[PDB]
């Protein structure tokens, strides 16, 4: 009973696990965000077996399915009612998402305008 997209291609991802920083588990000061090691004796840098994999260009997703939601749409950040009428010619391909700082009474302005335009909302019933 939701808003179907025009087509529903098979979403394929070469890797879904996050690329963690080297020795991120051993320390708290070392965050999860990836940093490329540049040490002379770094095992990860020279691709040793059984080590942390590094991000490469080969892990890129397909251009047809890039930035596409599992529902089949692509997201678009919407702040007010006026930004909704942009997507009514992009109805079957792109969906709208309300921003975090939008008030509850302005969120309940948005939802029905996209319902009249049949625009899918990722988070329709956010606050209530």
């Amino acid at each position: 009973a939701a808003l179907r997209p025009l087509v529903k291609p098979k979403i394929v991802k070469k890797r879904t696990k996050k690329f963690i920083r080297h020795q991120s588990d051993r320390y708290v000061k070392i965050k999860r965000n990836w940093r490329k090691p540049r040490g002379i004796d770094n095992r990860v840098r020279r691709r040793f077996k059984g080590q942390i994999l590094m991000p490469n260009i080969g892990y890129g997703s397909n251009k047809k399915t890039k930035h596409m939601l599992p529902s089949g749409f692509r997201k678009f950040l919407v702040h007010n009612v006026k930004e909704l009428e942009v997507l009514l010619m992009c109805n079957k391909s792109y969906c709208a998402e309300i921003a975090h700082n939008v008030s509850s009474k302005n969120r309940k302005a948005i939802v029905e305008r996209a319902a009249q335009l049949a625009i899918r909302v990722t988070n329709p019933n956010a606050r209530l």
Partner: peptide
């Protein structure tokens, strides 16, 4: 013109 989320409108 507005640009966000890898789109242009």
């Amino acid at each position: 013109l507005i640009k966000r989320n890898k789109q242009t409108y």
